[PDB]
Design a binder for this molecule. Sequence first.
Ligand SMILES: *C(=O)CC(=O)[C@@H](C)CC(=O)C(=O)O
Length: 352
Amino acid sequence: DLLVPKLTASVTDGAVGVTVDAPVSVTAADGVLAAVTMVNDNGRPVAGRLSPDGLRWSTTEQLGYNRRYTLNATALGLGGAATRQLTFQTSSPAHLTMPYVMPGDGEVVGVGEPVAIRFDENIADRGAAEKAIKITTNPPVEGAFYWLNNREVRWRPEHFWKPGTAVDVAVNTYGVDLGEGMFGEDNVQTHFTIGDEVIATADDNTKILTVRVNGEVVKSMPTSMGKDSTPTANGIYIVGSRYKHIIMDSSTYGVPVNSPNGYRTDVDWATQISYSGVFVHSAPWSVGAQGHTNTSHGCLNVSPSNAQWFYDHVKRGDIVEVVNTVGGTLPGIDGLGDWNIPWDQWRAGNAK
Ligand SMILES: *C(=O)CC(=O)[C@@H](C)CC(=O)C(=O)O
């Protein structure tokens, strides 16, 4: 004997806290869908599509926070007709946080470049945030998340990227509970590629900044680094932004200008390598000391032509390594200091 059609939805009638990170769907068995409509509270229909075989209907546009939706579906079969009405209520956030991802879409960056997702609000459930961030790499390589502060999480492999790696970042935070009633305001997505290996090494024993490109020495720059009382920290630096010129203002990095180690200086050809305020930059006033003596507040002073060369040939995500200074080691949570955190510590993370 014949059977009556059955209607199954990806939600149920009376549901609350329905999350809007996924489409809503309806499926017919023992029959086909003859009509499916979904309206919000205000009678506005929601866009949807019925599969060609008539069995599956799904929403096709974003579903909104704080809504009551009503589904009406009818299924017909040889055995008769069935109709259902489902009303459900979606998540009601207390807060919304918007994520901002670096590096930029379509960019080509150095082998030291981490994926960065910065939220504009403190994240209570770091684990939920991590889970919602989908990273694809090609060639595939293991990586892991680490939080630099309450708002910004970083993802990187254990070692520098292999040049030519495609990296894809899907921050799928819309509809996701990030804790304490905070939900993602929107999704973001970036895709970037790893370019040549560029590693510049500043050795305090020689006072030379050597630039190597895929293992080959292409540039050797006499440099003057931080004087003993304001040394350049040892360790690994990720290259950040670059400037044809910039006013370096110590107060930006915590030191009052009118302090003994304060300064406010206009400089050319400046490449930032730490949030703490270390740059490679043109320093014509210390060209005599470069290659011989440290005289700066911590920056890598090099000649005008070498600073410009550095500006022209080094890109975001390239690496500067400092060795043998009287300084300590650059903090791992500096912002550009990710690689100074040991991998076991990085991999274990701090989602807590
Ligand atoms: C960088 O943060 C500050 C520096 O170390 C350079 C600007 C050089 C410098 O301060 C100097 O007086 O030579």
